[PDB]
Nucleic acid binder design. Structure first.
Ligand SMILES: [Mg+2]
Ligand SMILES: [Mg+2]
Ligand SMILES: [Mg+2]
Ligand SMILES: [Mg+2]
Ligand SMILES: [Mg+2]
Ligand SMILES: [Mg+2]
Ligand SMILES: [Mg+2]
Ligand SMILES: [Mg+2]
Ligand SMILES: [Mg+2]
Ligand SMILES: [Mg+2]
Ligand SMILES: [Mg+2]
Ligand SMILES: [Mg+2]
Ligand SMILES: [Mg+2]
Ligand SMILES: [Mg+2]
Ligand SMILES: [Mg+2]
Ligand SMILES: [Mg+2]
Ligand SMILES: [Mg+2]
Ligand SMILES: [Mg+2]
Ligand SMILES: [Mg+2]
Lengths: 140, 120, 55, 101, 107, 94, 95, 86, 41
RNA sequence: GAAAUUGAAACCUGGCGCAAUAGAUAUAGUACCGCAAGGGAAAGAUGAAAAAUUAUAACCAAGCAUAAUAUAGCAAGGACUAACCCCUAUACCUUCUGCAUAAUGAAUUAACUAGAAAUAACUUUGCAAGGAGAGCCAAAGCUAAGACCCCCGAAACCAGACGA
RNA sequence: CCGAGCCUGGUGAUAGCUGGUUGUCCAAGAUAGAAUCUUAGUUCAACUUUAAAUUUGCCCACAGAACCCUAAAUCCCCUU
RNA sequence: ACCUCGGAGCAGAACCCAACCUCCGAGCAGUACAUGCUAAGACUUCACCAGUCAAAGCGAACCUCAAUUGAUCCA
């Protein structure tokens, strides 16, 4: 022997340092951790898109819930919001229902009024005075 | 077997019914086609994917301009089923040199020369 | 073996060989070794150019 | 991205703004502001003269080391990378509204 | 990893936002050497920018050991006493300036 | 009960997939805008022999720029500055 | 092909290609077309003259035997009464 | 949601594309000074600028091609008069 | 010359200040790791 | 696979050789195995003083105790106030058209274990119709350097010994 | 443990066949076929890669490409 | 049973295209003896080996068929 790695002790310890919380013989031995440490790291990467999808769909359940408490459903709700030009994402729309249901009631009342305005427009498209809240702002 | 499909030119002859629908007057025809991709490049022949790359529409939801002339028409005709086409029309004349930066596109194919960014 | 300011020499040959090719040369220089590297054989032209200048 | 915020509250952003620590800034965009008994919603946002949302920058970190591993099975495809994205901590010092309406 | 690493709720040191802002970096302790080729970045950084760094931040206090060291170090402790050491071994002056700047920025 | 022979998507017998109004509504939208396309790329602006030689100048000068870019290929320039800055690693105080 | 010998540890050229081919210093190799000495009675005149004429070699098979040969066979040789003197050099070759 | 409605009025299907939701400055100094432009806003303006310079190049070339034909036709009608005059 | 007046101000040359022309001695590439190690080409 | 021919310059006491799975097989051809030819090992470590067993040297592999178990599932990830409880997730390598595959190998830990090189090119120097410290190459080439080419495994064949 | 013993030596026998081949990071990249005591392989072709010289490459517009015995297309092709 | 070569369909329309897919054939024959020598330019049985066409000039007169066959060393 002329050339031998002396710091083999450390380059494996950093691997096991991240894998201390593993159960069984994985945290103790090396090769058991090598199979699981990269797999645990791989699951960490693509779990972000799961964190996005899970938390996104969770906000849908929350806003769908507060709407049903006030007598509406989520698909009709956001349709009236974007029709009435309010760009509030599902985070604040959900979080608003948590702390000020009085405000979310106004959002629901604002949304329900746009539905009746839209149905009035369904009866007569034009040839009538447009809805007061259905009126839009023109940017240029 | 599957090969390049030649299209009859008679199909691309607008009738008076089509004229009243899309509002495109035949006289005074527009000059430029706003092009945008929706369908994926994958699962298409080699000639369909390189043409749209030769047109420069590898990116989706990216408006890109082409000419309204019979030569380029043959290109996006064979790959017409990969893209959207919309004509170019503007009220405010061509973009002047002073208003090169403050331009802005619209969903209706408009290209406003001036953009001061606040409502009436 | 360019000695001194190579940038003055490479600029001279660039202006000298420009009209022959119709484009400015894009040659390479190495002031450490004091060398030049010019595309295309122009030795007979560079020889007469260096002689009439007196190098 | 949106945030629900008030006064005397912290907030983080996943990038650098090129602001020195301790400087104040006036935020332009607000979708709505609301008090105990009313709310001021925009179309989409509120006017400039209506509100004045001031916030101070206090602190800037490099993000904690986020590790990523791209792996494929039985083909010897694996790789590592560690990122430390820049982060900045703001705080909304105070919010006020104008009588103009 | 999130589960292997500890976590916390976001919070500032004694609410530095409302009142007068205070640079929450207390002290910097540079460990350079009169020799060692790796210390060229730290020494040239001591020549040019550490002077201006002190003029820019009168609040922060700086110390320089200038003792024999195979590897230069820079130690930084804050008001809370949280010590954080980073290695400036074989680093350019531009990187060290940005490094000391963000250390001054963070809490 | 309810198995199928072999693979679910090939062969003499596979799982018979059926259509939903969602997919129907999706595809009619794609070909009806293609009918809007079919109207627009008709009625051309110029004729074949009109647009013959109008852009040959740009395509020529553009290709000549690619030629100049291709010929412009050499190693980078070397300097005494960047060579002797390596000597400064042993810069040390008096 | 016999990269290192045993008595001196050098490449060894086989005398096969020596008898079959000939080198010009530019890197070219020629050869006599095969089948030029067999069954000439049945061949048309256009065929036998095509066989009598020399032929060059592709770059690959030329490169192949070039790997085989040694530097001694690649040197410049100034023979007398040699018609290949006009062809050892190359003239008017661009790219 | 609402993408079909937004393009009905002419707005972006995604509000992040264009409009006041993104194009305005997202922060300014407390003293009322204007903040520098954002990197997203700069590349968008450069994209629209090259887009505008491109469209002007595309239009003028077609106009040059149209008139260049009619100038050739006027030359064509000219030399036909020359034929009968000879 | 412009070459020598730099060296008088620049530090003294030694083994530590020594380096070859970049591009001459390219680094050796051994088959150890993920890239080459699997089959070594 | 040549030869004719040509013709070299030293004192030996040194190592960019190894440090107990290395280096001779070796503490020794010793133990042990085989009637025989022959095959063939393993190991030790205090301190100046052991006519000082003084004396935290204490902390480190696997393996265990100190300290068993808690509905449910590649042993984890996102996380969460909270370990679990929720959503997500078909081990590693080889092989193959294609594998969680119920195809191969792997109990685990420590140590050892597997890409050596020539013309011909290319990069960097040097000099230049010359180059190279005889010899060799040459219609800008020549000289020098650089990087480029793995291990384990059979039934067998032959010669000479040793055995009824 | 005799379809011909066992030991050493030639011997690191050879094996187109299996087994396995060690640090990090990035780019490009599966591609017609011919011959072979040849189909478990190899040489060439083609494809792919590196560093370069030069200029056309690709899509393609009218025209053009068989009698014999009524197809989707294909080849070439200035423009764009 | 087949192993090489040529023609037709599969392969309808530039080229190519396999199956122990469907058919018909070849391993010659006949007439001259310039069936002599050289030479531009090109194709090529998907590489190579091979196989092909040939202006013009010297020198002369005034080839058909489709496969119709075989490298190197050696003699
Ligand atoms: Mg989503
Ligand atoms: Mg099945
Ligand atoms: Mg030993
Ligand atoms: Mg232990
Ligand atoms: Mg579960
Ligand atoms: Mg599977
Ligand atoms: Mg491996
Ligand atoms: Mg299989
Ligand atoms: Mg298994
Ligand atoms: Mg097997
Ligand atoms: Mg045997
Ligand atoms: Mg034998
Ligand atoms: Mg007896
Ligand atoms: Mg026996
Ligand atoms: Mg072997
Ligand atoms: Mg890639
Ligand atoms: Mg062309
Ligand atoms: Mg061919
Ligand atoms: Mg003739």
């Amino acid at each position: 022997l002329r050339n031998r790695v002396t710091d083999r002790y450390f380059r494996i310890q950093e691997v096991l340092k991240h894998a201390r919380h593993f159960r069984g013989r994985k945290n103790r031995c090396y090769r058991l951790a090598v199979r699981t440490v990269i797999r645990a790291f791989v699951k960490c990467t693509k779990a972000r898109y799961l964190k996005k999808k899970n938390m996104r769909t969770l906000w849908i359940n929350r806003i769908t819930a507060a709407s049903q408490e006030h007598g509406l459903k989520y698909p009709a709700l956001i349709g009236n919001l974007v029709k009435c030009q309010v760009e509030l994402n599902r985070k604040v729309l959900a979080d608003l229902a948590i702390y000020e249901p009085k405000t979310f009631k106004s959002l629901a009342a604002l949304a329900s009024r746009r539905r009746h305005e839209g149905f009035a427009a369904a009866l007569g498209d034009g040839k009538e005075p447009e809805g007061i809240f259905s009126r839009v702002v023109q940017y240029h | 077997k599957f090969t390049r499909s030649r299209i009859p030119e008679k199909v691309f002859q607008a009738s008076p019914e089509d004229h009243e629908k899309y509002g495109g007057d035949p006289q005074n025809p527009h000059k430029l086609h706003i092009v945008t991709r929706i369908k994926s490049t994958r699962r298409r022949p080699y000639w369909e994917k390189d043409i749209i790359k030769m047109l420069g529409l590898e990116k989706a939801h990216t408006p890109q301009v082409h000419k309204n002339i019979p030569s380029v028409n043959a290109k996006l005709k064979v790959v017409k089923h990969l893209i959207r086409i919309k004509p170019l029309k503007l009220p405010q004349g061509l973009p002047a040199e002073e208003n090169m930066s403050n331009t802005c596109l619209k969903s209706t194919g408009e290209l406003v020369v001036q953009w001061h960014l606040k409502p009436v | 073996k360019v000695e001194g300011d190579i940038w003055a020499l490479q600029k001279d040959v660039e202006d000298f060989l420009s009209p022959l090719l119709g484009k400015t040369p894009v040659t390479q220089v190495n002031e450490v070794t004091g060398t030049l590297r010019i595309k295309g054989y122009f030795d007979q032209e560079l020889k007469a150019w260096l002689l009439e200048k007196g190098f | 991205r949106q945030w629900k915020v008030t006064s005397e509250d912290l907030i983080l952003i996943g990038n650098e703004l090129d602001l020195a620590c301790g400087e104040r800034i006036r935020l332009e965009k607000v979708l709505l502001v609301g008090a105990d008994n009313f709310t001021l919603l925009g179309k989409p946002l509120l006017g400039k003269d209506l509100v004045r949302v001031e916030a101070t920058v206090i602190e800037k970190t490099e993000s904690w080391p986020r590790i990523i591993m791209r792996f494929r099975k039985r083909k010897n495809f694996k790789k590592k990378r560690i990122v430390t994205t820049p982060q900045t901590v703001l705080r909304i010092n105070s919010i006020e509204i104008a009588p103009c309406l | 990893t999130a589960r292997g690493t500890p976590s916390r709720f976001l919070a500032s040191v004694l609410h530095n936002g409302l009142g007068r802002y205070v640079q929450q970096l207390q002290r910097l302790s540079f460990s350079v050497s009169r020799d060692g080729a790796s210390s060229r970045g730290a020494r040239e950084f001591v020549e040019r920018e550490v002077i201006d760094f002190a003029r820019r931040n009168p609040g922060v206090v700086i110390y320089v050991n200038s003792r024999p060291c195979c590897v230069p170090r820079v130690v930084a402790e804050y008001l809370n006493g949280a010590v954080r050491e980073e290695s400036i071994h074989c680093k350019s002056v531009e990187e060290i300036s940005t490094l000391v700047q963000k250390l001054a920025d963070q809490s | 009960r309810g198995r199928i022979p072999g693979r679910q998507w090939i062969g003499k017998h596979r799982r018979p997939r059926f259509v939903s109004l969602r997919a129907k509504q999706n595809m009619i939208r794609r070909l009806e805008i293609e009918a809007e396309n079919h109207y627009w790329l008709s009625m051309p602006y110029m004729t074949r022999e009109q647009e013959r030689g109008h852009a040959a100048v740009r395509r020529r000068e553009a290709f000549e720029a690619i030629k100049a870019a291709a010929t412009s290929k050499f190693p980078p320039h070397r300097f005494i500055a960047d060579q002797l800055d390596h000597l400064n690693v042993t810069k040390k105080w008096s | 092909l016999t990269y290192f010998s045993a008595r001196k540890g050098k490449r060894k050229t086989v005398k096969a290609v020596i008898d079959r081919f000939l080198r010009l210093h530019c890197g070219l190799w020629v050869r006599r077309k095969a089948g030029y000495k067999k069954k000439l009675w049945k061949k048309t005149p256009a065929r036998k003259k095509r066989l009598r004429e020399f032929v060059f070699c592709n770059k690959t098979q030329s490169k192949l035997l070039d790997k085989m040969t040694t530097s001694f066979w690649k040197r410049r040789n100034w023979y007398v009464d040699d018609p290949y003197q006009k062809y050892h050099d190359r003239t008017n070759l661009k790219v | 949601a609402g993408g079909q409605w937004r393009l009905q009025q002419g707005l972006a299907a995604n509000p992040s594309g264009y409009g006041p939701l993104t194009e305005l400055p997202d922060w300014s100094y407390a003293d009322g000074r204007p903040a520098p432009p954002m990197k997203g806003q700069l590349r968008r303006k450069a994209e629209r600028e090259t887009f505008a310079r491109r469209v002007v190049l595309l239009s003028q070339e077609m106009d040059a091609g149209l008139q260049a034909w009619q100038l050739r036709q006027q030359k064509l009608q000219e030399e036909q008069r020359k034929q009968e005059n000879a | 010359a412009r070459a020598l007046d730099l060296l008088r101000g620049l530090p003294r040359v030694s083994l530590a200040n020594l380096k070859p022309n970049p591009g001459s001695k390219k680094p050796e590439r051994r088959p150890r790791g993920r890239r080459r190690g699997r089959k070594c080409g």
